[PDB]
Amino acid sequence: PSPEILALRWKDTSAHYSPHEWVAARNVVTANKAALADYFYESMLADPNAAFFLSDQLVKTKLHASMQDWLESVYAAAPTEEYERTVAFQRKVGEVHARIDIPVHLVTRGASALIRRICELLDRDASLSAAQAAATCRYVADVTMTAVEMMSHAY
Amino acid sequence: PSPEILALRWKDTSAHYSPHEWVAARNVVTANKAALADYFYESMLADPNAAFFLVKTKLHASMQDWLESVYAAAPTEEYERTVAFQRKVGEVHARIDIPVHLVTRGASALIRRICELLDRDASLSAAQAAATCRYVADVTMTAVEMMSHAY
Ligand code: HEM
Numbered sequence: 001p002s003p004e005i006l007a008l009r010w011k012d013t014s015a016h017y018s019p020h021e022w023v024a025a026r027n028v029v030t031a032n033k034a035a036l037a038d039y040f041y042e043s044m045l046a047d048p049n050a051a052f053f054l055s056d057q058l059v060k061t062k063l064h065a066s067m068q069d070w071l072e073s074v075y076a077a078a079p080t081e082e083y084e085r086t087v088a089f090q091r092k093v094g095e096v097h098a099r100i101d102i103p104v105h106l107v108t109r110g111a112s113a114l115i116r117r118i119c120e121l122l123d124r125d126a127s128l129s130a131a132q133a134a135a136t137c138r139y140v141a142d143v144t145m146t147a148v149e150m151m152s153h154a155y
Numbered sequence: 156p157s158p159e160i161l162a163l164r165w166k167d168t169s170a171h172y173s174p175h176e177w178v179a180a181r182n183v184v185t186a187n188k189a190a191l192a193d194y195f196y197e198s199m200l201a202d203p204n205a206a207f208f209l210v211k212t213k214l215h216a217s218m219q220d221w222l223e224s225v226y227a228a229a230p231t232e233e234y235e236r237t238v239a240f241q242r243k244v245g246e247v248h249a250r251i252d253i254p255v256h257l258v259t260r261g262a263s264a265l266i267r268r269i270c271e272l273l274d275r276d277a278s279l280s281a282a283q284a285a286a287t288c289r290y291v292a293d294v295t296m297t298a299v300e301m302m303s304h305a306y
């Protein structure tokens with residue numbers, strides 16, 4: 001399924017939501033990416049299965065500073081109309097993960113932790129009505145699980 | 156990969172939400188057990204990828220039991236029950252080489268149609284409806300991961 005075909009799936013997903021949701025989310029996620037990357041990394045030390053794959057020094061440069069640009073790839077695609085660029089990024093990361101038999105259930109695990117944590121930021125952000133913080137959190141979960149689905153194409 | 160460990164995981168995820176969130180969802184899920192199984196199945200036909208793999212009767216009911224299972228776990232505290240079944244379901248899909256990325260496709264689809272129904276439900280304050288939709292998306296994904304075990 002080429003990135004022309006898989007673009008339209010990202011687009012049609014993002015189109016369930018207003019521009020206000022797209023940007024709202026994007027702003028919160030760039031505002032706190034490095035902090036959201038730390039929280040991710042720590043979450044999968046806590047998991048021993050996942051900790052096996054982290055030799056406690058590989059993140060120093062790679063995993064912390066990379067998880068950042070993932071968060072930008074994902075949350076900008078829609079407000080930029082740059083879908084096939086983003087979708088392409090996801091297959092690379094999916095293929096990287098699959099090459100080293102990183103079990104897919106742990107990715108879905110991580111997708112879920114981020115979603116709970118990004119919504120927690122949306123919640124604690126006082127510059128929004130709870131109606132808005134709600135609708136953004138929805139978008140967040142949808143696009144994460146859209147991305148993860150595509151990351152999962154390499155199995 | 157013990158169920159006792161897993162069961163515990165189900166408890167914590169759903170502990171993030173109020174009991175009112177658990178029963179509201181269950182209500183709407185079971186109020187539409189048929190229409191939801193019909194939606195999921197017809198959503199597979201649209202795509203060729205899944206349509207590859209499609210007796211419906213067995214399907215139509217076995218989705219209807221999964222739903223009943225997923226939203227029974229928290230309000231009844233039978234986590235082991237609900238887990239053990241997610242474990243089985245995945246191992247079936249597995250041996251058929253049903254690609255993982257699609258179990259997630261229809262998972263996301265059910266979530267979106269479930270919240271639509273929660274938007275429409277005026278027994279609920281919009282606050283609750285959002286809350287409930289969130290529960291629904293989290294717990295589905297939680298099921299999804301457990302299904303995705305040993306793939
Ligand atoms: C939502 C979930 C996840 C996202 C968004 C994510 C993101 C990324 C990205 C962007 C890269 C860089 C790959 C590249 O472009 O070259 C990467 C690499 C990697 N990720 Fe993940 N990841 C996720 C889940 C996981 C999980 C659950 C583990 C658990 C073990 C993991 C372990 C790794 C490792 C080890 C590498 C580098 C491979 C190596 O050099 O040994 N990731 N990840």
Ligand code: HEM
Pocket residue numbers: 199204205206208209214217218221243244247248251253257258259261262
């Ligand atoms: C969220 C996603 C899904 C859920 C919750 C789900 C649920 C179920 C359940 C509960 C069963 C009964 C398993 C058993 O008898 O023990 C089942 C069987 C089956 N599912 Fe799924 N399913 C999902 C996705 C898919 C997808 C994407 C396909 C794509 C083709 C698929 C095809 C089947 C087939 C063919 C069987 C029956 C196998 C057989 O009896 O020969 N399912 N599913």
